[PDB]
């Protein structure tokens, strides 16, 4: 049989960015899995005054914001005929310029903020860290080890929004073969990643990964060492690394283009001055542990930073234990850089992410008279307030090579070959094939996860890239499982 | 409510506001059934032992299918569909380890 127990935080008053200590008590013989439970408090941006027209104010990430004068372009110079600029809410509601406390920015959490939260998890036994891991290896085992059947619930565990399916009414369609009723299927999200004026308190249930979490039979005994010796130190993310602000004000331009056809074009551009978000109050900070009442696979990880241009090779000697598989993740440091406007969207993405922008525009052509009907008399071209943004993740590696000492082993394999064929062919049912080109899998010793028996065993990671060098660097993340013996 | 909007100006002297606007909605809107939880805390009270005692609904309904059952148990999309484990692993082998 088994039951569950709670662990109160030993630190006292958790705060984001500060270390939390949890203490394992003595209540049984075996304990393997555990979950840190937090209730992050409600957040909202501060009230901000509506800007005056013709004023340029310094915005976030070194990018200047501006509210242009009438008859000018966006940059408040190079005049554009017919341009008229007003202020609107993100849902189209007018905002009067110069109003005191006129709008709020829309706070939205990170994508997978639960993995971002546990930035440094460490298991200490009077020092001497048995396992220390970070958010990047958690993202790696998300993209590889989670089966994908149990994803949405996992998306509920780490606070990621899950798409909800809706349907329109019945619609007429013609069937061509060489008249029918169909319903369109739409999808829409509601979670913390959707920008809201008032984010509700978000409940995060974060699993802890160690060598004994894989199986129930691998749980370490609690009688060999005293319970007043084991601690868990979690260094959390900053308040600026979890919630971001979305523009609560949009400069709307209406441009009238005269002649024939007479066009009215409505376009939008966000006005994003950084406001103040209230402090997140962590609530109900518990540590659920399963207690059972009656050699090993260790995530030996190391994440390093590389700055060389168009080709690189590192130096390392720490890994000595035999391995079974080898998971690689290359992330440009601009993904997690604070100067990135999309760093909350892209902190977890292994690859170079460009943005593809659909601008869904409503078009209409109206003729006022029936004599000159060749061209429309007037046209309307109305864009949406916020466009449709697709994060397109392009690979950075052109060739990968893990050069060993006496053997070359992996030598200049293509990135797509590894990243697609190796997860597809190896791993059994456990390893999901990732959607990110920078999430790579390479095999050294045997089949990754099918049985508990080693059939054989035995590392400078290097690459040739087309990515830039000192302008934007790249970091490597590993989740290779080493085989360790305890005696 | 997917609504098409259009702004038409008949003339080029007063172009500040549109002369006419069209706001046409669809006949039938787009309806999303949003399934919100009803339970705040679940508890299966046994006779001599309390067993499950005031666990949150999200904890059960999300973490228990995610962690237990092997590849057989799909994690439900409904918050009111919870899973609770009493004796052993749900479906991995034909051998009881306890009850």
């Amino acid at each position, epitope marked *: 049989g088994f039951e569950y127990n709670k662990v109160r935080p030993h630190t006292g008053t958790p705060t984001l960015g500060n270390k939390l200590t949890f203490g394992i008590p003595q209540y049984g013989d075996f304990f393997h899995d555990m979950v840190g439970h937090h209730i992050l408090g409600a957040c909202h941006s501060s009230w901000q*005054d509506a*800007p*005056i*027209q*013709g*004023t340029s*104010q310094m915005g976030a990430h070194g990018q200047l914001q501006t509210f242009p*004068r*009438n*008859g*000018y372009d966006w940059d408040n*110079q190079t005049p554009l*005929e*017919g*341009a*008229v*600029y*007003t202020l609107v809410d993100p849902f189209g509601r*007018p905002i*009067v*310029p*110069g109003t005191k406390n006129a709008y709020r920015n829309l706070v939205y959490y990170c994508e997978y903020p639960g993995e971002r939260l546990y930035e440094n998890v460490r298991f200490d036994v009077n020092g001497n860290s048995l396992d220390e891991y970070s958010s990047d290896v958690t993202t790696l085992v998300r993209k590889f080890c989670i089966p994908g059947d149990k994803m949405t619930g996992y998306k509920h565990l780490v606070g990621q929004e899950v798409s909800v399916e809706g349907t329109s009414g019945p619609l007429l369609c013609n069937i061509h073969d060489l008249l029918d009723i169909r319903r369109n299927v739409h999808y829409s999200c509601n979670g913390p990643q959707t920008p809201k004026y008032y984010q509700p308190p978000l409940a995060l249930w974060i699993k802890l990964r160690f060598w004994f979490n894989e199986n129930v039979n691998l749980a370490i005994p609690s009688v060999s060492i005293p319970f007043g010796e084991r601690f868990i130190t979690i260094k959390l993310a900053s308040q600026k690394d979890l919630v971001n602000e979305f523009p609560g004000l949009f400069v709307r331009q209406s441009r*009238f283009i*005269a002649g024939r056809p007479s066009r009215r074009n409505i376009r939008f551009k966000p006005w994003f001055i950084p406001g103040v978000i209230n402090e997140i109050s962590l609530t109900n900070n518990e540590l659920y542990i399963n207690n059972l009442f009656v050699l090993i696979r260790v995530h030996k990880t190391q994440v390093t930073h590389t700055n060389n241009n168009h080709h690189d090779e590192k130096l390392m000697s720490a890994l000595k234990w035999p391995i079974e598989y080898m998971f690689i993740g290359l992330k440009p440091t601009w993904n997690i850089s604070d100067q990135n406007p999309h760093q909350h969207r892209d902190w977890h993405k292994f690859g170079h992410v460009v943005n593809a922008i659909m601008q869904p525009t409503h078009h209409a052509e109206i003729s006022f008279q029936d004599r000159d009907t060749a061209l429309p008399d007037a046209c309307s071209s109305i864009s949406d307030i916020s466009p449709v943004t697709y994060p397109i993740t392009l690979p950075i590696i052109k060739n990968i090579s893990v050069t060993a000492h006496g053997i070359n082993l992996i030598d200049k394999f293509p990135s797509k070959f590894c990243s697609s064929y190796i997860p597809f062919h190896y791993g059994g049912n456990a390893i999901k094939t990732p959607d990110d080109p920078g999430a790579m899998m390479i095999t050294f010793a045997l089949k990754p996860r099918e049985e508990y028996q080693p059939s054989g065993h035995i590392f400078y990671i290097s690459w040739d890239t087309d990515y830039v060098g000192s302008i934007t660097t790249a970091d490597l993340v590993v989740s290779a499982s080493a085989i360790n013996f305890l005696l | 409510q997917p609504t098409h909007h259009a702004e038409i100006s008949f003339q080029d*002297r*007063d*172009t*500040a*506001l549109p002369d006419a606007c069209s706001s046409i909605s669809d006949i039938s809107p787009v309806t999303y059934p949003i399934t919100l939880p009803i339970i705040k805390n679940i508890s299966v009270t046994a006779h001599g032992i309390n067993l499950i005692d005031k666990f949150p609904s999200k904890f059960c309904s999300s973490y228990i299918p995610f962690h237990y059952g092997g590849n057989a148990i799909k994690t439900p999309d409904d918050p009111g569909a919870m899973m609770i484990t009493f004796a052993l692993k749900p479906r991995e082998e034909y051998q009881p380890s306890g009850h």
Partner: antibody
Amino acid sequence: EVKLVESGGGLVQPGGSLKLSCVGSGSTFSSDAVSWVRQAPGKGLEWLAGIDGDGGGGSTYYADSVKGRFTISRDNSQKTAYLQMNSLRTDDTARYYCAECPMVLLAKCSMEFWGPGVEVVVS
Amino acid sequence: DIVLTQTPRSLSVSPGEPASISCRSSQSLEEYGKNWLSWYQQKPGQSPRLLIYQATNRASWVPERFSGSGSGTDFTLKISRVEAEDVGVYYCFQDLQPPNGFGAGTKLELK
């Protein structure tokens, strides 16, 4: 190019009323705040009145010396602004300008575009 | 309300020499992090023309000899080298809130 034309001032007895038109050709005159400004002879410039553009409202703002006596308006169909002087006294002889801020609300606007103005003499 | 006082009335500065124009306000002219004083130049026989907006910025036509005044309640326009086309009348204009006001008006003429 944004242009403004004022019309017009003339010989007016010390009891009367005037209707000054300011016609604008700038393709955004209907969304541009319009101010009326006075320069008396032997005196510096003196702000008189201001009015907003379309979008947000049509509020009018007035100098305390001529508040109630003056009536500002605008007709955007002909791209014109209007200044009505009622019961103007003998010190109202001055050069009058209409200025067109390239901005909607007249709260903190900068008077960029001007016109030649008209000289109103009161006698 | 706010009254703007121009301490210099006439300078009579030599050509090629710097000139200074002072304007003081009743209280602070600053709102939303930017000053709201403007400077206007009127040449003899010409309509008024915007010289400086927001007390530190300038129009597109402005050559590189007009300083961006100061900050707070006191401002001082400075011309580095008068080029004999700067002879005229300069005004400091309130842009905080209506009713806006003009300065006394300082006449610059060479000597």
